[PDB]
Design a protein around this nucleic acid. Structure first.
Lengths: 25, 300, 1290, 18, 21, 25, 50, 150, 50, 15
RNA sequence: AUUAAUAA
RNA sequence: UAUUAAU
C-alpha cells in the first residue's frame, strides 16, 4: 500500500537500473 | 487469399483513438464463410471480363448499414471497371455505388469545406474543397468509362500473333504489363494510375485525410493484386474456348443498347460487405490446373 | 414429467436399497448415519482396554436396527444376496461363463490377458502367482462402489419395465455363490476375497456396462419415436446385437474384444460407399482441401460415379480378411467356452456392406452407426502383462539395389536439413551457451534423486525425484564430464520401462530417460518443436515449405472436435475426392538404423555446420549429438522390465545345486522361485506336469533395444518426417509406374498416420488394382509393411485421428468410460471433481449419449461422492467435534454424510454444483437461479429445488488454496546460474536491490523470487500435500460449525472483480422478431435439448471470439514456458495497476524482464498494454465456466456477430462491463432456445427517471472507485475511464 | 412468453413497499 | 418413465426432419 | 458495500413480481 | 413502432468519447408507459390532420 | 554502444497519448542479435570511408513494414554521405531511401499544406508548405552530394 | 403433366458458384389438392375456348 | 455517503 | 511419459 | 496441479 510513482522518480530509478545492467553486460 | 500488413490500418485508419467512424468500424470486423464465397465470386468475375458481371443483393431478413454503404461506395470505384472497352458490373450496381459515394462525401461536412451544388439533382453534382474540385467525373458513364478503372487508361492491347488466332487481345488492368515475373515483397512501390490518383485528390479535397493516407499506403498491394490477375488472364486462360475478339468487342455496346442477338453475360450477386473484404484480400495462385498441358490434344 | 422429481425419487429408492431402514428425505440437504466396525477395538485390546458391549452391538442392529449413537441410528450395507431382491433367471450366458473356468494346471505365466482360473481352499505358489496377477489387473478404481452401481441398475430396471442381460447374469451368480468380492468404500482400490474365480470384478463391471448401454440405447431410441433401427430398409434390433456381442466375449473378454475392434470399425467405415444413388450434405470452403472455413446448406441425392469400381480385387480381399478375423474369433470362443453360438446378425449384415445405402438424414441409420462404434467399452481398461522382448537384429531390412532403404534415409536427411532453415526463417534457433542453464527448465520424475529438509509451521526429511526439485537442487551435477560419458549398456547401469493403462487397447510402454541424455537432445531439437508447434498452412504437394504438411497441432487447437475437423466433413461430402488413408503395423519397431537413424543423425550434423565456433562448457556440437543420441545413450541401451518366467518341477528344483539357486540382485514375483541364470532355468524347465515357476536373478534377462523410443525429446517430429519421406517415395513411384492416373491435392502426416486427398481418373478395375499393388509394393520396399485389411481407399468416407465422416456428416463414437479409471482417484476437492464430471457428461451427450440418462447418472454420483470421507469427526448434540481417544461410546464409529440429489442444481457459491436442469451445457450461477425462478415456464421443474437451496452443507476441500506455513530449510542452490541477465545484474549489487524494493514487484522481486519458485515447486509434490493436509479435518469441523443456512446474491464479487451478476444492475426485456429459418449443421444424432439449440442458433462460422483482458494476458504468458507455472495474469494485472497511467513502453519491458520474464514475452505484454491505455478500465472478469465446454464452443455465441444481432446495450459501458453483459446474453439466449421461447432480441433498458439513474451512478462509482483502493492511495484520478464517470448517466 | 427480468433495485423497492 | 423433453421442441425436430425427408 | 438480495424475501414477493411483469406486458 | 439502426447514432451523435451534449444525453434512454401513450397520441394526431 | 536519454523521446515523439505514428510505434522496439551485428557493420562502414559501402537486404522469411521504411527514409539522409568526395553506400540504396522519404513526406497530407507537383514523376519532385520549400534537392546525385551529409 | 428442365432457371459454373433465380420460393413450392384441381380447371378452360 | 466528484477525488488523494 | 483444451 | 481428449 502506497502512493503511485510519478514519471520523474520512476524514470530516475529505471535509468539507474539500465546503467547497472549495461555495466554487468 | 492474402491479407496485408496490419501496421497500415493501425497507423492510418485507427490513428486517432478518441474517434470512431465508418472505416474504423469496418477495419475491426471478421468475415464469415458466405462472405468469403462472395469474394471468390468477385474474383471469378474479375478474371473473365465482360463474360461474367456482378450485381448487389439484399436478403429479405437483412437491413441496410450506413458505414458499410459508404465503405463499399468508396471501394467499388477502385476495384471495378465500368465502361470504355468492357465492364465488370451492371448499370444498377454502378448507380448504387455512385449514390453511396455521394453519401460518404457529405458525411461530416462543415463550413470550412466549401460545397457548391449544381443545377440538377443528380448525385455527386457539386464542387468541393478550397480549390473547388469537380465531383461530376465520378458518376458512371458506360460509354466513356469515367470514374472507374478504365478512365483514361489503355485496357486492351494487340501486340503480336498468338497461338490461337481468334483471340489476339491482351488485357492490361491499371496499365500493367504482364511480361515480367514479380517479387511480391518489393513490387509496386512507385506505381500509380489515373483513377487512383484522382480519387486521392478528391478525398484530400473533401477533408478525408486518414482515409487518403490509408489508400495511399495500400497502393502496392493493389498493384500486386492486379498484376497477378493480368498474368492469370493472359497466360492461363488462353485457349480455343476463349471468346473471339469479334464477339468480345460487342459485349458492351449490346449491354448498353439492350440488344439480345448474341448470348447474354452471366450475372452473379454479392453482398455489400464482401466488397470491403475483397479489397483487403489478394488472390495468390499456389497450384496450376492439372489439365493445362493436356488441353490441346483434348481440343483436337 | 419433471426430471427433478423423478430423479429424486429414483435416487431416494437407490439410497433406501443400499442402506436398509434409513430415513432419506428429499426435503433436507443431507442425512447423517453412523457406521460400526470392530477392527479398531480388538487392536486397542492389545494395549489393555475393556468395553461393556462385547459383541452385542452387531446383534443389536443387524436384525433389530436399534443401535442409536446420541440419537443418530447405526446401519450397515445390504449384503450381496439381497441386492437384486432375490430374483433369479436361467441365463445361458452364466452357464457359458462357468464352463469357461479353468483349473490351475493350464496356467501360462506370460499370458497377455488372464483367463478364468479357479479359487481353491488350498494355496500353493501357483495360486499365489494368480493372486498377485489379479490384485493389480482386476482393479476397478472409479469413484463409486460397484454395489451402488448394481443397486442403481436394479432400480432403473424396475422403473423402466425392462431387464438387461448383465443384470440377469449378476443375479444368477449371486443367487448361488453369494459374495463375489469385498471392496472398501473409503478406498475403492482395496479389492480382496475372491470366491469363485479371479475375474469376478471384471464380470460385474462388464455386466454393469452392458446394462448401461442397453438403457442408453433404449432411451435414445425412445426420444425419436422409433421402434427399431434400420440397415438401409431392413429392420434390426440393437439389443440383439449388443447381447450377441456380449455373450461371445465371456470366456475371454479383453482378448476377444481387442480382436473384434477392427472388423466393426471397418464395416462402419465401408457402409454405403457403393450405392448407385447416394445422399450427401453439401459443403463449401476454400481452395485448399484442409481449409476450415466451411458452411453447410442442404441435403441432396446424386448418382454415384464410382459404382462399378467395387468389384475390384482390393475390395474383395478387404471384405474377405475382415470376415476371416471374425471367423477365427468365433472359432476361439466356441473352443474355449463349450458353446456353438456365433454372431449371425453382423455376419448377415457384413455380406452386403458396399451396396447397401446409408442415410445421414435418417436417425434410424445414424444411431445404428454410432452404436456400432461404442459397444467396445464393456470390457473396461486393457490392463495386461507386457513382457520384455529384445530387438531381433538378424531380420531387419538392409539397403539393396532392389530396395528403397537408402532412399528413405536420404530423404529423411534432406527433410531434417530443410527443417532447420525453415525454423530459422521464423527466427527460431538452437540454444546458445548463454542459455544452457536457463533452458533446462523446459524439461514428473527422473533418474536422479535428492534429499531436502522442510519445517512445519502453523524439521522433517523427505525423499523426492521430481524433475523440478532435482533440477533446483543439483542442476550443476547434470552437465559434468563424469556424468556425460557414462554408458548404460551393462548389468550395473540400465534404465527401467514403465506402464500406463489405456481405455481399451493393451498397456503402453513408457521409456524413462535420464536427464543427462535429455538435455543434449533438447539443445538441438527445441527449435524444431517450436517451429512445428503452430497450426495452419498449405498442404498442396506443389508447395515448397513443409511446415503445413506436418499437422501435429491441427487437432485439439480449439476446444471442439467438430470445429477442428470440418475439412473431413467437407471432403467426405465431395464427389471429386478420392481418399487414401494408410496405417502401418509396428511402426516404431521398423525404424532401424539402416532406414531411419543414420540419416537423421547425418542431417542434424550437416545442419549444425554454421555453428561450429560455439563451445558448450568446452564441448563442440558434435560431442553434443554424441551425448544425446550416442552408443550407450540411445542406440544400444540395456533396459530393465518384467521378468521372464519358466515352468518347472519342485523335485528337479531341490535336486538342483545350491549355487544355481542363488538369490541375485533382481527381484522376482511372489509365487516364483529364484534361479541364478537363464540357461540353468532353461535346462530344467519342462512343460507337462508343472508345479513350480522360476525366474533368473543375475541380470541376463535384460533386453537390448536398438529402435526408436517413445520417450525421446523429438519422437513425434522425427516420426512425422520419416512418414513424409515414405509418402514422397510413394508419390514418385506411383507417378512413375502409372502416369496420369492419380493426381495428389493434399498430403498430411501426423506420425504413423498418412492421409491423401486425390482425384482418380479411371473406372477400369484393372488399373485401380495396379495402382493399389504399386502403393503396397512401394510401402513394402521401404522396410515397413501395411496391412491391406486396414488400409482405406474409398470416396465419401474420411477418418482422421478418431474422427469419422460419412457423406458429409459426423459419425461420433463414445469411448468415455464412466465406471472405471486408469489409476486410483483421490478427491482432494469434491466440487472441482463434480464440475469436471459434468464436463465429461456434456462431452458424452455431444457424442450421442442420452441427456436424461446423463442427468440421472450425475444425480446418482452427487450423493455418494463425498460419503465415507469422515472418520475422525463425531456429531454429538448437533455439534461437530473431535472424538475422544478411548471410550465405550465413540470407539469404532464413523459418521457417514449423504447429500441430496438436487444439490447438482445449486449454484457454486451456495455449496452446490453449477448445473441447470434445462440443459447440461448451461451453468447455473446465482443470478441465473434468480432469473430461472422469475420464469413461469420453469415452475414445475424448479419447485423441488426451492426447498433445499439454502440447506447444502459445505464440501470437502483439503486443497483450500491458501496453503502457507510449509517453509523449507534447504535452499535452492541453482538460482545463481539459471537466472536471466536482468535478475543477475540486479543481484550483482545491493543498492540496485534497495532501489527495486521501491518497485511494486512484491513477491516476484529478484530478492525473493527464489523462495517463491522453491515453494511453488515443493507444493507441486503429492506426498508433501498429504503431509501438509494431515490436519484438515479440524478446519472442516470449524467450517461446519460456522455454517449458517442463508444464501444471498451480490452484485459485486470483490474489489476490482466483477461477474455476470453485474448484468442485474439494469432491467432486461426481449422484443423484436428475428429470422425463423432453421440452420444446418453436420453433427446429427443429438438429444432434442441440444438439437433445438443447434437449430435455433447456427454453428459457429466465425473463426474468432471476443476475449477479455485476463484471457489475452494469459495467452501471451503461455509463450514463456519457463515462467508459465509461476506468474499468472492476475499478478501481471496487479503490477500494471500498481503503476500509473503515465508510463512508457520501455519501462514496462524492463520491469517485466526484472520479474524474470523472457524478453520477447515482455515486449508482447508491453505493446499490448500500450495499445489499450485509453480503453483500460483496470477491472478483472470472473467467468464461472460459461461457454467453455465442448458443445457450447460449437455454437454461434460469444462472437461479435452474436452481439450485433442479439444485444442492444447503452454506449456508456466499458469493455469489461460489455464482456459481462455479453456472457449473460449468451447464456439467456441459450436458455430461451432450450425452453422453446420465441426468438427475440435482448435490450438493456434505462428510463429517464432520476432515482434509478442515481442508483446506477452510485453503484458504478462504487465498482470503479472502491473505498479500499482510495484509502490505500491506489486510484489514479487521471485515468480516462475514471474521468468519464462524471457525466455518464446524468 | 415471459415478462421482463427486473433489476435488483426494482425488487428492492417491491420489498420495501411491504 | 416418460420422456423428460417436452413436446414443443420435439414437434419442431419432427417438422425439420420431415422437411429433410 | 453493494446491496444484498435475500432469496427468502424474493420468494415471498414472487406473486407481486408476477403481477408487475403482467402489468408491464 | 420500430427504432432505426443503432449504427447511425453510433457514428454521428456518440462518435467522440471526450465530449457530451444534449443529443448524446438523450440517446441512451427508453420510454416509460406514459411516454409511449404520448407517442400514440402524436401519431393519432398526425393521421387526422386538422 | 550507448543509448540517449529517454526523456527526449518522451517529450517529443510520445508527447500526445491520443495519436500514433511510425516513430511512436517504432520507439517501442529493442534490437535482437542480428540487428546489433548490422549496427556493427554500419559503424565499420563509417570508419572506413569509400573502402566499405552498404546495401539494403530483405530476409527471405520476412515481409516489409511501412513504418520502418518511413523512419529509415529520414534517418538515412542524416546518417550517411552519398557524393562529392566519397560515398558510404551504393546508388541502389540511395534511390530506395529517396523513395522512402517521398513516401514519408506525403503520409498525412492535408489541404492547409500546399503541394504543387513537378513536371516529372520522379520521387521528391514537388514544392511543399506555405513558403513552397523545394524538395528536389533531397534526391541523390553522386556528382555533387546534395541531400546527404556531404 | 411435364415440368420444365431445371437447367433453364439456373446455371452452375464451378462447384460452389451458381446463379440464383428470381422465383426460387415459387419454383420450390408444391401444390395442394385444391390447387391441383384449380390447375385442372385452367386446362379445361384452355382446351374449350368460349 | 453522497456521490463523489472526480475533481474532488484528486484533491483528497493528493493530500 | 509428451503436447493441447477447460477448471482452480 | 485437477479432469479429459489424443500420440
Amino acid at each position: 500500500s502506497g502512493p503511485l510513482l510519478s514519471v520523474f522518480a520512476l524514470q530516475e530509478i529505471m535509468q539507474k537500473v539500465r546503467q547497472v545492467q549495461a555495466d554487468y553486460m | 487469399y492474402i491479407a496485408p500488413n496490419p501496421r497500415i490500418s493501425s497507423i492510418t485508419l485507427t490513428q486517432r483513438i478518441t474517434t470512431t467512424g465508418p472505416f474504423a468500424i469496418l477495419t475491426g470486423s471478421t468475415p464469415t464463410a458466405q462472405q468469403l464465397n462472395d469474394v471468390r465470386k468477385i474474383y471469378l468475375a474479375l478474371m473473365f471480363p465482360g463474360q461474367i458481371i456482378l450485381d448487389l443483393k439484399i436478403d429479405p431478413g437483412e437491413r441496410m448499414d450506413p458505414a458499410v454503404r459508404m465503405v463499399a461506395g468508396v471501394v467499388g470505384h477502385l476495384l471495378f471497371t465500368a465502361g470504355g472497352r468492357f465492364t465488370n458490373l451492371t448499370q444498377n450496381m454502378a448507380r448504387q455505388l455512385d449514390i453511396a459515394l455521394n453519401d460518404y462525401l457529405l458525411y461530416m461536412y462543415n463550413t470550412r469545406v466549401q460545397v457548391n451544388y449544381g443545377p440538377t439533382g443528380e448525385p455527386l453534382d457539386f464542387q468541393i474543397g478550397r480549390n473547388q474540385y469537380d465531383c461530376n467525373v465520378f458518376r458512371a458513364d458506360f460509354a466513356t468509362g469515367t470514374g472507374y478503372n478504365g478512365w483514361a487508361t489503355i485496357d486492351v492491347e494487340y501486340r503480336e500473333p498468338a497461338p490461337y488466332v481468334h483471340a489476339q487481345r491482351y488485357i492490361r488492368y491499371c496499365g500493367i504489363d504482364s511480361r515480367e515475373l514479380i517479387n511480391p515483397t518489393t513490387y509496386g512501390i512507385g506505381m500509380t494510375y489515373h483513377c487512383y490518383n484522382e480519387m486521392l485528390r478528391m478525398l484530400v479535397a473533401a477533408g478525408k485525410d486518414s482515409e487518403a493516407a490509408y489508400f495511399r499506403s495500400m497502393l502496392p498491394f493493389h498493384m500486386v493484386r492486379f498484376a497477378r490477375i493480368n498474368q492469370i488472364i493472359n497466360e492461363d486462360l488462353h485457349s480455343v474456348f476463349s471468346l473471339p475478339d469479334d464477339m468480345f468487342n460487342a459485349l458492351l455496346p449490346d449491354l448498353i443498347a439492350g440488344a439480345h442477338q448474341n448470348a447474354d453475360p452471366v450475372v452473379l450477386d454479392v453482398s455489400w460487405i464482401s466488397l470491403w473484404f475483397a479489397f483487403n484480400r489478394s488472390f495468390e495462385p499456389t497450384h496450376r490446373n492439372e489439365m493445362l498441358e493436356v488441353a490441346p490434344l483434348i481440343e483436337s | 414429467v419433471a426430471i427433478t422429481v423423478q430423479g429424486a425419487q429414483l435416487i431416494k429408492r437407490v439410497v433406501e436399497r443400499f442402506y436398509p431402514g434409513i430415513a432419506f428425505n428429499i426435503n433436507e440437504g443431507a442425512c447423517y448415519i453412523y457406521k460400526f466396525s470392530d477392527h479398531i477395538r480388538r487392536i486397542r485390546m492389545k494395549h489393555g482396554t475393556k468395553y461393556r458391549r462385547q459383541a452385542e452391538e452387531i446383534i443389536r442392529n443387524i436384525s433389530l436396527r436399534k443401535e442409536r449413537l446420541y440419537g443418530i441410528p447405526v446401519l450397515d450395507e445390504v449384503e450381496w444376496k439381497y441386492v437384486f431382491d432375490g430374483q433369479t433367471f436361467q441365463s445361458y450366458a452364466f452357464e457359458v461363463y462357468v464352463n469357461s473356468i479353468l483349473p490351475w494346471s493350464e496356467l501360462d505365466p506370460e499370458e497377455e490377458f488372464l483367463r478364468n482360473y479357479r479359487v481353491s481352499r488350498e494355496m500353493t505358489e501357483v495360486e499365489k502367482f494368480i493372486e498377485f496377477r489379479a490384485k493389480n489387473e482386476m482393479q476397478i478404481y472409479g469413484d463409486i462402489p460397484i454395489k451402488v452401481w448394481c443397486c442403481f441398475i436394479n432400480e432403473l430396471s424396475a422403473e423402466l419395465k425392462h431387464v438387461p442381460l448383465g443384470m440377469q447374469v449378476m443375479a444368477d451368480f449371486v443367487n448361488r455363490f453369494d459374495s463375489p468380492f469385498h471392496q472398501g468404500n473409503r478406498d475403492l482400490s482395496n479389492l480382496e476375497d475372491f470366491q469363485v474365480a479371479y475375474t469376478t470384478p471384471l464380470l460385474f463391471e462388464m455386466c454393469c456396462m452392458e446394462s448401461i448401454l442397453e438403457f442408453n440405447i433404449k432411451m435414445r431410441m425412445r426420444e425419436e419415436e422409433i421402434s427399431a433401427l434400420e440397415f438401409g430398409d431392413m429392420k434390426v434390433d440393437p439389443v440383439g446385437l449388443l447381447r450377441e456381442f456380449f455373450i461371445l466375449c465371456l470366456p475371454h473378454p479383453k482378448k476377444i474384444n481387442n480382436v473384434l475392434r477392427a472388423p466393426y470399425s471397418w464395416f462402419v467405415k465401408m457402409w454405403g460407399v457403393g450405392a448407385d444413388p447416394i445422399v450427401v450434405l453439401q459443403s463449401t470452403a476454400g481452395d485448399d482441401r484442409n481449409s476450415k472455413d466451411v458452411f453447410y446448406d442442404k441435403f441432396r441425392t446424386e448418382p454415384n460415379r464410382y459404382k462399378a469400381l467395387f468389384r475390384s480385387s482390393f475390395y474383395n480381399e478387404s471384405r474377405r480378411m475382415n470376415e476371416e478375423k471374425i471367423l477365427e474369433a468365433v472359432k476361439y470362443s466356441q473352443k474355449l467356452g463349450s458353446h456353438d453360438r456365433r454372431l449371425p446378425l453382423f455376419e448377415k449384415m457384413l455380406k452386403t456392406v458396399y451396396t447397401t445405402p446409408f442415410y445421414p438424414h435418417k436417425s434410424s441409420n445414424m444411431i445404428l452407426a454410432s452404436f456400432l462404434l461404442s459397444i467396445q467399452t464393456i470390457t473396461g481398461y486393457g490392463r495386461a502383462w507386457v513382457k520384455n522382448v529384445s530387438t531381433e537384429f538378424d531380420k531387419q531390412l538392409k539397403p539393396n539395389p532392389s530396395n528403397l532403404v537408402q532412399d528413405v534415409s536420404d530423404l529423411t536427411r534432406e527433410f531434417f536439413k530443410q527443417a532447420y532453415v525453415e525454423a530459422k526463417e521464423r527466427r527460431e534457433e538452437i540454444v546458445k551457451p548463454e542459455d544452457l542453464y536457463t533452458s533446462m527448465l523446459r524439461l514428473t520424475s527422473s533418474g536422479f534423486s535428492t534429499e531436502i529438509y522442510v519445517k512445519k509451521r502453523f524439521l522433517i526429511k523427505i525423499n523426492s525425484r521430481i524433475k523440478a526439485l532435482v533440477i533446483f537442487t543439483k542442476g550443476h551435477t547434470v552437465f559434468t564430464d563424469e556424468e556425460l560419458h557414462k554408458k548404460y549398456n551393462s548389468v550395473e547401469l540400465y534404465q527401467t520401462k514403465g506402464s500406463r493403462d489405456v481405455p481399451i487397447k493393451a498397456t503402453r510402454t513408457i521409456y524413462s530417460i535420464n536427464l543427462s541424455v535429455l538435455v543434449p537432445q533438447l539443445i538441438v531439437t527445441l527449435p524444431l518443436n517450436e517451429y512445428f508447434s503452430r497450426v495452419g498452412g498449405i498442404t498442396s504437394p506443389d508447395y515448397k515449405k513443409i511446415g503445413g504438411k506436418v499437422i501435429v497441432g491441427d487437432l485439439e487447437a480449439t476446444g471442439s472436435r467438430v470445429m477442428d475437423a470440418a475439412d473431413c466433413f467437407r471432403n467426405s461430402a465431395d464427389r471429386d475426392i478420392f481418399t487414401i488413408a494408410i496405417d502401418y503395423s509396428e511402426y516404431d519397431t521398423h525404424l532401424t538404423r539402416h532406414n531411419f537413424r543414420t540419416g537423421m543423425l547425418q542431417g542434424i550434423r550437416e545442419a549444425m555446420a554454421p555453428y561450429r565456433d560455439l563451445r558448450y562448457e568446452g564441448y563442440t556440437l558434435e560431442q553434443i549429438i554424441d551425448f544425446g543420441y550416442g552408443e550407450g545413450r540411445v542406440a544400444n541401451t540395456l533396459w530393465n522390465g518384467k521378468r521372464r518366467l519358466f515352468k518347472t518341477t519342485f523335485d528337479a528344483y531341490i535336486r538342483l545345486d545350491e549355487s544355481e539357486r542363488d538369490k541375485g540382485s533382481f527381484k522376482v514375483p511372489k509365487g516364483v522361485l529364484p534361479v541364478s541364470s537363464v540357461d540353468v532355468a532353461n535346462r530344467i524347465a519342462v512343460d507337462k506336469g508343472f508345479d513350480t515357476l522360476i525366474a533368473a536373478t543375475d541380470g541376463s534377462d535384460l533386453a537390448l533395444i536398438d529402435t526408436h523410443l517413445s520417450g525421446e525429446n523429438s519422437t513425434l517430429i522425427a516420426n512425422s518426417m520419416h512418414n513424409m519421406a515414405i509418402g514422397t517415395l510413394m508419390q514418385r513411384e506411383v507417378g512413375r509406374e502409372q502416369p496420369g492416373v492419380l493426381t495428389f491435392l493434399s498430403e498430411q502426416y501426423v506420425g504413423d498416420d498418412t492421409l491423401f486427398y486425390t482425384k482418380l481418373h479411371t473406372t477400369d478395375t484393372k488399373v485401380f488394382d495396379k495402382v493399389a499393388a504399386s502403393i503396397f509394393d512401394t510401402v513394402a520396399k521401404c522396410g515397413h509393411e501395411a496391412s491391406p485389411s486396414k488400409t482405406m481407399m474409398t470416396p465419401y468416407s474420411v477418418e482422421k485421428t478418431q474422427t469419422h465422416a460419412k457423406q458429409g456428416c459426423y459419425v461420433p463414437q463414445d469411448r468415455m468410460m464412466i465406471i472405471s479409471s486408469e489409476r486410483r482417484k483421490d478427491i482432494e476437492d469434491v466440487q472441482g471433481y463434480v464440475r469436471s464430471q459434468v464436463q465429461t457428461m456434456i462431452t458424452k451427450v455431444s457424442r450421442g449419449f442420452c441427456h436424461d440418462l446423463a442427468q440421472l447418472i450425475l444425480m446418482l454420483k452427487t450423493t455418494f461422492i463425498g460419503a465415507w470421507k469422515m472418520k475422525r469427526t463425531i456429531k454429538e448434540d448437533a455439534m461437530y467435534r473431535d472424538r475422544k481417544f478411548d471410550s465405550n461410546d465413540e470407539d469404532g464409529f464413523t459418521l457417514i454424510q449423504i447429500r441430496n440429489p438436487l444439490a447438482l442444481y445449486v449454484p457454486i457459491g451456495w455449496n452446490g454444483y453449477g448445473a441447470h436442469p434445462a440443459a447440461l451445457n448451461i451453468v447455473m450461477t446465482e443470478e441465473m437461479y434468480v432469473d430461472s425462478i422469475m420464469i413461469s415456464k420453469l415452475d414445475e421443474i424448479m419447485a423441488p429445488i426451492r426447498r433445499i437451496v439454502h440447506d447444502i452443507p459445505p464440501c470437502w476441500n483439503e486443497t483450500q488454496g491458501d496453503k502457507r506455513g510449509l517453509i523449507s530449510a534447504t535452499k535452492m542452490s541453482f538460482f545463481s546460474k539459471m537466472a536471466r541477465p536482468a535478475v543477475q545484474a540486479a543481484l550483482s549489487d545491493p543498492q540496485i536491490i534497495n532501489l527495486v524494493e521501491e518497485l511494486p514487484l512484491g513477491e516476484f522481486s529478484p530478492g525473493r523470487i527464489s523462495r517463491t519458485m522453491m515453494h511453488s515447486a515443493l507444493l507441486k509434490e503429492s506426498s508433501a500435500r498429504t503431509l501438509l493436509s494431515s490436519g484438515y479435518e479440524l478446519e472442516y469441523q470449524k467450517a461446519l460449525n460456522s455454517w449458517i443456512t442463508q444464501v444471498s446474491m451480490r452484485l459485486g464479487e470483490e474489489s476490482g472483480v466483477i461477474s455476470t451478476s453485474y448484468a442485474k444492475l439494469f432491467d432486461v426485456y426481449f422484443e423484436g422478431e428475428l429470422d425463423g429459418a432453421p440452420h444446418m449443421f453436420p453433427d446429427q444424432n443429438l438429444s432434442p435439448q441440444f438439437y433445438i439449440q443447434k437449430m435455433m442458433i447456427g454453428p459457429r462460422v466465425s473463426s474468432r471470439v471476443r476475449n477479455s483482458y485476463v484471457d489475452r494476458i494469459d495467452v501471451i504468458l503461455r509463450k514463456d514456458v519457463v515462467m508459465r507455472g509461476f506468474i499468472t495474469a492476475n499478478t501481471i494485472l496487479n503490477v500494471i495497476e500498481k503503476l500509473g497511467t503515465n508510463h512508457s513502453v520501455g519501462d514496462l519491458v524492463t520491469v517485466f524482464t526484472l520479474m524474470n520474464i523472457e524478453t520477447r514475452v515482455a515486449e508482447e505484454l508491453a505493446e499490448y498494454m500500450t495499445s489499450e491505455k485509453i480503453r483500460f478500465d483496470a477491472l478483472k472478469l470472473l467467468k464461472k465456466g460459461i461457454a467453455g465446454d465442448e458443445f457450447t464452443m460449437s455454437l454461434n455465441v460469444a462472437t461479435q456477430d452474436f452481439i450485433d444481432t442479439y444485444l442492444a446495450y447503452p454506449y456508456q459501458l466499458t469493455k469489461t462491463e460489455v464482456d459481462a453483459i455479453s456472457l449473460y446474453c449468451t447464456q439467456m439466449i441459450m436458455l430461451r432456445a432450450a425452453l422453446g421461447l420465441p426468438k427475440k432480441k435482448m435490450k438493456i433498458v434505462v428510463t429517464d427517471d432520476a432515482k434509478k439513474r442515481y442508483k446506477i451512478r452510485l453503484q458504478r462509482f462504487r465498482t470503479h472507485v472502491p473505498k479500499i483502493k482510495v484509502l490505500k492511495k491506489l486510484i489514479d484520478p487521471n485515468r480516462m475511464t475514471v474521468r468519464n464517470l462524471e457525466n455518464q448517466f446524468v | 412468453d415471459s415478462g421482463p427480468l427486473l433489476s435488483v433495485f426494482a425488487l428492492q423497492e417491491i420489498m420495501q413497499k411491504v
